């Protein structure tokens, strides 16, 4: 058969609750236990229905749009591989959530920026610091398990970087990034005011940085300076998305996407790095497709 996993209706930097996934999956083939708090809060525990080969298709989440940079989102990445799973196995599924869009804004001043008549952030740039207008990074989607007393990653589908506030007027996507080494470090993205994405094991250096799985994987908050400026700022998505400031937030991944270290007005956040465990049989390479939240589809192979 087929098993479809979602964010259970959840949005933003925080993952779903048991109640949300219970309602989302009622009447479908999917039953999960949702992590109630702590490190794996919002992570969906799925009992594998018997030994066999499973094609796992993981989709990371898209980044947010910027207030004056909204032609498209950086799409979350699709990765897929076939896994040999045994009896009694359980998988852990964190469905990445979309980086928040700058628009519609969450305050009167931020909604003024979205209507385009306000140029105050731009004017104060290139002249206490004025900032805002960026989109948060999308969360990556993580498929993993417990083996020999360690969390073991199987698939990580990278999230998209959020868009910067602005884009160059004369503007007329980057290649998908893949890690396939089990020993590889799951470090985080660069950043600053705008947050880099969280990786598999990264440590967040700020409230804006996307959190890693080791930290609970929540999206980063929007930068405090933009909250001070506009009364609101876009957060990264659950699954390690970085918070926006003026530059966009980085996408979550096995390694997180880089965000600007100078809150540059035109600097889109970069996408996360996907991961396909090298013991699996690759099905299809990483391909950016997702327009909104991530998801996971499992089918027998």
């Amino acid at each position, epitope marked *: 058969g087929s098993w479809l996993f979602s964010t259970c209706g959840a949005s933003g930097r925080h993952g779903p609750t048991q109640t949300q996934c219970d309602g989302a999956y009622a009447g479908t083939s999917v039953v999960v*236990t949702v*992590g*109630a708090a702590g490190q794996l809060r919002g992570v969906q*525990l799925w009992r594998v229905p018997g030994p066999g080969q499973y094609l796992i298709s993981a989709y990371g989440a898209a980044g947010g749009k910027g207030a004056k940079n909204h032609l498209s989102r950086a799409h979350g990445v699709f990765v897929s591989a076939i896994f040999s799973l045994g009896l009694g196995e359980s998988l852990y599924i964190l469905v990445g959530q979309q980086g928040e869009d700058a628009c519609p804004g969450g305050s009167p001043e931020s909604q003024l920026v979205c209507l385009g008549e306000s140029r105050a952030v731009e004017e104060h740039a290139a002249m206490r610091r004025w900032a805002g207008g960026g989109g948060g990074g999308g969360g990556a989607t993580y498929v993993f398990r*417990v083996r*020999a*007393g*360690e969390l073991e990653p199987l698939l990580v589908a990278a999230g998209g970087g959020g868009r910067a506030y602005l884009r160059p007027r004369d503007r007329g996507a980057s290649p998908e990034k893949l890690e396939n080494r089990s020993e590889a470090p799951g470090s985080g993205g660069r950043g600053g005011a705008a947050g880099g994405g969280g990786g598999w094991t990264s440590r967040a250096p700020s409230p804006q940085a996307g959190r890693s799985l*080791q930290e609970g994987a929540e999206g980063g908050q929007g930068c405090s300076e933009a909250w001070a400026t506009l009364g609101w700022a876009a957060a990264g998505g659950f699954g390690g998305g970085g918070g926006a400031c003026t530059a966009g937030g980085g996408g979550g991944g096995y390694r997180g996407g880089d965000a600007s270290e100078t809150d540059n007005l035109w600097a889109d956040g970069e996408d996360g790095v996907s991961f396909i465990h090298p013991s699996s049989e690759l099905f299809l390479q990483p391909l950016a497709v997702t327009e909104n939240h991530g998801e996971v589809e499992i089918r027998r192979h």
Partner: nanobody
Amino acid sequence: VQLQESGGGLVQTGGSLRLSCTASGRTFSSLAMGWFRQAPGKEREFVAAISWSTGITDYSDSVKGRFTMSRDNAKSTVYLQMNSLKPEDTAVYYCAAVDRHSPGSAWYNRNFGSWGQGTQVTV
């Protein structure tokens, strides 16, 4: 943050060893500790776990009844009383701060990849 195992040794079939593990600079959200073992040529495997506060324990089937895990909160130390030992128990025994997704799910090292030297047990 920092863990150290001791108490390993060579023993015959039957009879007991008492392993200890001390933990300096606790995490204050690290609620549980766990014993794992790795015999030569096999994967590290769960042995037992315990809560710091309640002292409630969890055991793998291979050791249930023969191994008792305990802890001393004031000292930040956990113990493994291994009785009725058997040659298949030979392994390097490792201590870890552990967590689990939910009741009934598998224990994992909350400090990813962070493992001490362990203590050698030979039966």
